[PDB]
Design a binder for this molecule. Structure first.
Ligand SMILES: NCCc1ccc(O)c(O)c1
Ligand SMILES: NCCc1ccc(O)c(O)c1
Ligand SMILES: [Cl-]
Length: 545
């Protein structure tokens, strides 16, 4: 019983809606396997040590994302930045769950709406294989037609400048999701359903998609590595962003979750198991998705590179198509979309609780009024997600998914790593981990924390800034001002670090060096500053690993 509970806890903690929904289309856009090589490399090098670092910080300090920086006051700006990034992500992370709920509601019938066209939302150009040529993305399939016309109603929007009005069905779905999240978060701080359904679905998908008419060529395309594409840095940027998405680092979720953990909990084992399960699940998901889309390529008589969209919604075009060919399609559709709802709800409560804990640890008034604060956060998310359910809401969702995270999250995580490792001290961090868990981290962990991970993060951030491709959605090109809007969205969270550094420097009293010492010394050691004994002002601190 207890062993099963531990296994379920680890397995559920190792899964996210990202691994199931976002990895599919990032791997399909970025190549096949030319995405897994950067994915695995970054996973190990940065994601494992940084996941471990965030868990250890949260566990030892017993503070949220913002207040954990009492160890180094100057990085409370980084804390605020990660909180803001988590706030930004929710606006559309909760609209994907509205899509999932709409699909689940549609799944309750003996004739799935995505099996063939002939409905009201169907265009005259629909082609039913049972009943293009170039580089387009084949938006004339019954499943794609359903997703884009009976769900999104995208055909009524000419672009992000003509988004239109909110859809009254996705509106109700979002209302339901928002109410559920609030009522699940309004009291304080699911594993059985979440830790089992994703793996059952993934296993059945593998077993069924392997034996399909055209899965062989899809798998062949999956297992071909184009090293012409590792030489572009788009795959590397995507891999880094997806790693920090699936693992949960950079949003303040890990610190907030770990602040409630036991003081003697083992974070090294947690990081190891989470990373291993994440890698295995990502590889298997890529395999299954590529088999499914190779099958579609065979069925629709179109090239593997044009069967499906390369943006959000690839899963909502793929998984229904695979379900339609199973026996008892209604049962499997219901099961799969219930799994999607469970995963999305778990991740949404995780992010919202990260935000709430980070903001309530800072202010005691918010802590004393969890109900009102939770209602405010939930209502703000509901409104700024209503912004994304419009007719042209897929364009807004693409803009957000591209800009809210990405360079901003990479910068925030790099700043966190730099702060801890260099200013607070990797030696001090190792001593704290030893005190918590009884063993000092190995040399590999310290090197990754101090030198390797910050360097790779800096390289990725610099490349993502200097090598920026204008935003697009399949065959639609965003207007120039949309790119400025997205860059402003990213900068709104990136700039919070220097702003808080300047504010802290100005507010603090004393001379320049006194202000610096008060800014880099832990709040509980501020009585050393009067004694002129600061470790950071000695070469030994900066020359110690
Ligand atoms: N892995 C990130 C999960 C996450 C983060 C922030 C959110 O607002 C959310 O709904 C979900
Ligand atoms: N940019 C298109 C993505 C893609 C997916 C699979 C392939 O086999 C391939 O050559 C290309
Ligand atoms: Cl992933």
């Amino acid at each position: 019983g207890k062993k099963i509970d531990f296994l379920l806890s680890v397995v559920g903690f190792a899964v996210d809606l990202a691994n199931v929904w976002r990895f599919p289309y990032l791997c399909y856009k970025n190549g096949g396997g030319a995405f897994l090589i950067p994915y695995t490399l970054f996973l190990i090098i940065a994601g494992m040590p940084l996941f471990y670092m965030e868990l250890a910080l949260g566990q030892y300090n017993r503070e949220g994302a913002a207040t954990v920086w009492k160890i180094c006051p100057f990085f409370k700006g980084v804390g605020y930045a990660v909180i803001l990034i988590a706030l930004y992500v929710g606006f559309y992370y909760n609209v994907i769950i509205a899509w999932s709920l709409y699909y689940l509601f549609s799944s309750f019938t003996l004739n799935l709406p995505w099996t063939d066209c002939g409905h009201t939302w169907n265009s005259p150009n629909c082609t039913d294989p049972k009943l293009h040529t170039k580089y387009s993305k084949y938006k004339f399939t019954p499943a794609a037609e359903f997703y884009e016309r009976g769900v999104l109603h995208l055909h009524e929007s000419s672009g992000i400048h003509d988004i239109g009005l909110p859809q009254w069905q996705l509106l109700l779905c979002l209302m339901v999701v928002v109410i559920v999240l609030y009522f699940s978060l309004w009291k304080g701080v699911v594993v059985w359903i979440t830790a089992t359904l994703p793996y059952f679905v993934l296993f059945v998908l593998l077993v069924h998609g392997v034996t399909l008419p055209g899965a062989s060529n899809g798998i062949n395309a999956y297992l071909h590595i184009d090293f012409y594409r590792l030489k572009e840095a788009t795959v590397w940027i995507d891999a880094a962003t997806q790693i920090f998405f699936s693992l949960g680092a950079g949003f303040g979720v890990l610190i907030a979750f770990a602040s409630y953990n036991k003081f003697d909990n083992n974070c090294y084992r947690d990081a190891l198991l989470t990373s291993s399960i994440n890698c295995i699940t990502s590889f298997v998901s890529g395999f299954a998705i590529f088999s499914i889309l190779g099958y579609m390529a065979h069925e629709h008589k179109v090239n593997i590179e044009d069967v499906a969209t390369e943006g959000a919604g690839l899963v909502f075009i793929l998984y229904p198509e695979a379900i339609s060919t199973l026996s008892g399609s209604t049962f499997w559709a219901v099961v799969f979309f219930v799994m999607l709802l469970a995963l999305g709800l778990d991740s949404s409560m995780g992010g919202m609780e990260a935000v709430i804990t980070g903001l309530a640890d800072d202010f005691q008034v918010l802590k004393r009024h969890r109900k009102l604060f939770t209602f405010g956060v939930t209502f703000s998310t509901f409104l700024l997600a209503l912004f994304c359910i419009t007719k042209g809401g897929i364009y807004v969702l693409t803009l957000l998914d591209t800009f809210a995270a990405g360079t901003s999250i990479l910068f925030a995580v790099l700043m966190e790593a730099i702060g801890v490792s260099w200013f607070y001290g990797v030696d001090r961090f190792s001593n704290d981990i030893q005190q918590m868990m009884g063993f000092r981290p190995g040399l590999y962990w310290r090197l990754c924390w101090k030198f390797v991970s910050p360097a790779f993060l800096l390289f990725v951030v610099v490349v993502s800034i200097i090598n920026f491709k204008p935003l697009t959605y399949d065959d639609y090109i965003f207007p120039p001002w949309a790119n400025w809007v997205g860059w402003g969205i990213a900068l709104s969270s990136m700039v919070l670090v220097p702003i808080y550094v300047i504010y802290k420097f100005l507010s603090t009293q004393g001379s320049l060096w006194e202000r610096l010492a008060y800014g880099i010394t832990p709040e509980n050691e501020h009585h050393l500053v009067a004694q002129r004994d600061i470790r950071q002002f000695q070469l030994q601190h900066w020359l110690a690993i």
